[PDB]
Amino acid sequence: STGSATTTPIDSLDDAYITPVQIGTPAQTLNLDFDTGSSDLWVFSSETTASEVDGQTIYTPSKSTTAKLLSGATWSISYGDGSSSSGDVYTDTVSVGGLTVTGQAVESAKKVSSSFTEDSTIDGLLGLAFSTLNTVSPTQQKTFFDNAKASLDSPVFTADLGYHAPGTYNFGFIDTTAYTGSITYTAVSTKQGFWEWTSTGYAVGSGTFKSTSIDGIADTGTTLLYLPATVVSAYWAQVSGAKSSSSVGGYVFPCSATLPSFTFGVGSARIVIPGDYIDFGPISTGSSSCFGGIQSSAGIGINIFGDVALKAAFVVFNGATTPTLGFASK
């Protein structure tokens, strides 16, 4: 089997991407944030505290003939930006782009933090990290990908995110028309539950490539590219007027600037992020200070190849017995 679903930016900045997912019988379609940096499929639901729902589409398990309470199971998750959610658990039939898993754990939110309430476009998350990160207790649950894997033609999914444009998540096959050149595969450590890999270096604009190992995670659920302070300083030093602002929370630059590209290494190959992908627009409405798409990982504890990096590439999440990551230009 295979599946193929279109993923769409939630706003004009590509702050996140939503993909329609069918849950239950008859189908209830929710727009979920596919997140290779977490392992819980959770949804706004008929159980979410009413004051914490503001325009989201909700899953109502009582209207699904295939929903079953996962008795006694609860979940609770905290994210890197300080947001969080928690609740109870059902199992139900879940379909993504034509690919169906029966008995998938669907984590129903009873509580969500303010940032989730305030984003009416995201109805929940679909976790695609390793199932060892799943927060369901007392019986840990598997991701949609792990449950689908044995049925897939090939044990893979791919992320082809667009820049201010739709893109595609495919399950079970590699669309050879979706990328240029060849796919460069690189080793993955699963020890922290993430798609954790090591980039081979970077270049700023037309500068000479610096060979240096940069461990990080491939995270479709993170907006920006978070890298060591040395790398990020070298990038922003090339932009007139750029500076790090503690009041804003990162590097800002004059909105009048044209940004240099940023290249990252994957083995001996190179992925080029165009400068425009690094522009996240005014820090506040009408400001002439713009927020940068490359930021320091210093506050985080881990480097994150988020959407800014991933949307420049066709990315293969290879869930074979030894997992690997593939990157191709596109």
């Binding site: 702050d15 940032s115 479709t220």
Partner: peptide, 6 residues
Amino acid sequence: XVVXAX
């Protein structure tokens, strides 16, 4: 930005 399970 958002940063998804730290």
